[PDB]
Amino acid sequence: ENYLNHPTFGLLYQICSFGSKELFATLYAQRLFFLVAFDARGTRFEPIGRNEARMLVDNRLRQLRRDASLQEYNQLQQVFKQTF
């Protein structure tokens, strides 16, 4: 539920973190998705499509069950069911 203003596409919201690139998406029905790089250079962006972004959050869900906690599994679960 973290927000970020894209120059062209306006407001975005965070889907998940990775390691630390976080996944972000458009607010009206999430048609586009963005990989962000908070470098000293600043805010580096990298657009991705539904097909790739679906399986990518899917991978993170599998990663949290295997070697990770639950609170974060449960909340990302709601995020995934919200988007896809």
């Binding site: 062209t8 029905a29 048609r31 586009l32 657009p47 991705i48 499509g49 539904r50 097909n51």
Partner: protein, 213 residues
């Protein structure tokens, strides 16, 4: 110009043939192409999980669509349902061939921004139509657009040169097929329209437009 310029991006570029009712692109497809309608009509629609279709616009000849590809490239996935409402001819140039083609021809970039402009206004024109409250006023506004884009001159008025279902109309003006039928029948009693071979024909369009003072 648009017809002429798109002929030269690829070796020429072949006119793709698409049959009646065939889908052009589905939601989920990578947006890697820009399209140009040459002959016929194309319905762009949004589909919900409830199974509901909403017509975004019904595009006519020399129109540019598939415009998602110009923002991020093949990176983004489609979301609308592009279906040929009638038999259609079109061109289908890729984004990476277009990045080439724009720096190549500044005459084409002129030609393209022309087509894009037209789209904005035609889509904004539709906003005017839907922003009415009287569904009566809203329907006529929509009818006028159809006559503008697909109407052919006729003996007593203008026949909208394409077959249209009451649901297809209802999906475009935010209504049920029922209400479309009701209001059309009331215009037939007012004898402002006629249905000939399933085709809607307008009587004295201008008089209908003058009701939008």
């Amino acid at each position: 110009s648009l017809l002429t310029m798109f002929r030269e991006l690829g070796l020429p570029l072949q006119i793709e043939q698409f049959e009646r009712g065939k889908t052009i692109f589905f939601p989920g497809d990578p947006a890697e192409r820009v399209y140009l309608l040459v002959k016929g009509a194309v319905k762009l629609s949004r589909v919900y999980e409830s199974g509901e279709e909403i017509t975004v616009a019904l595009l006519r000849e020399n129109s540019v669509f598939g415009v998602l590809s110009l923002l991020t490239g093949q990176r983004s996935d489609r979301f609308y349902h592009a279906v040929a409402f009638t038999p259609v001819q079109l061109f289908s140039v890729p984004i990476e061939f277009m990045q080439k083609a724009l720096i190549e021809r500044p005459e084409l970039a002129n030609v393209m921004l022309q087509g894009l402009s037209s789209r904005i206004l035609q889509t904004e024109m539709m906003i005017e139509t839907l922003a009415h409250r009287d569904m009566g006023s809203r329907l006529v506004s929509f009818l006028l657009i159809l006559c503008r884009d697909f109407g052919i001159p006729s003996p007593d008025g203008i026949t909208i040169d394409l077959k249209l279902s009451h649901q297809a109309i209802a999906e475009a003006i935010g209504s049920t097929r029922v209400t479309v039928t009701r209001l059309l029948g009331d215009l037939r009693e007012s004898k402002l329209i006629a249905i000939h071979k399933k085709r809607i024909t307008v009587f004295n369009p201008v008089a209908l437009s003058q009701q939008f003072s």
